[PDB]
Amino acid sequence: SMNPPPPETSNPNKPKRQTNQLQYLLRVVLKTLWKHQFAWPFQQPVDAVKLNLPDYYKIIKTPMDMGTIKKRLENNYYWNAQECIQDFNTMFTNCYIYNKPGDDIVLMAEALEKLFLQKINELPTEE
């Protein structure tokens, strides 16, 4: 059970736009989550080989992490803020699916998710 390649982060064949909502997701949301005390395990794809989790990618077919989301924002991969919000939600849900409730990694994800939801509530309206 080798690791898969990381998610795609740059596609020159997709149309691009710079918007106040996408800028907020990078400059505020990704920034504030990245610096959270529990952010480290979520800053790069799950290395299931190094962590000796041979079933991780048998269970999780839509992996996602904040390093990927940072790159997607930087490369104008998303047309809409909702596409980026979905990637964050996928990251949290993957953790909740793979692990037992109350596991340390789940409590950490839950704390990151709480901060995420607060920042998404303050998502500015489209300019």
Opening angle at CA 55, ends 113 and 102, nearest 5: 35
Task: Report d(CA 74, CA 52) in Å as an integer.
Answer: 31
Which ranges in the chain belong to alpha helices (H)? 20-24, 31-34, 56-59, 66-74, 81-98, 104-121
Taking the least distance from each CB to ligand B0Q, the nearer of 23 and 45 is: 45
Taking the least distance from each CB to ligand B0Q, the nearer of 17 and 100 is: 100
Taking the least distance from each CB to ligand B0Q, the nearer of 22 and 64 is: 64
Q: Using CB under 6 A as the criterion, which residues of the chain lie in contact with ligand B0Q when the complex forms?
A: 40-42, 46, 51, 53, 95, 98-99, 104-105
Task: Give the shortest CB-115-to-ligand B0Q separation in angstroms.
Answer: 16
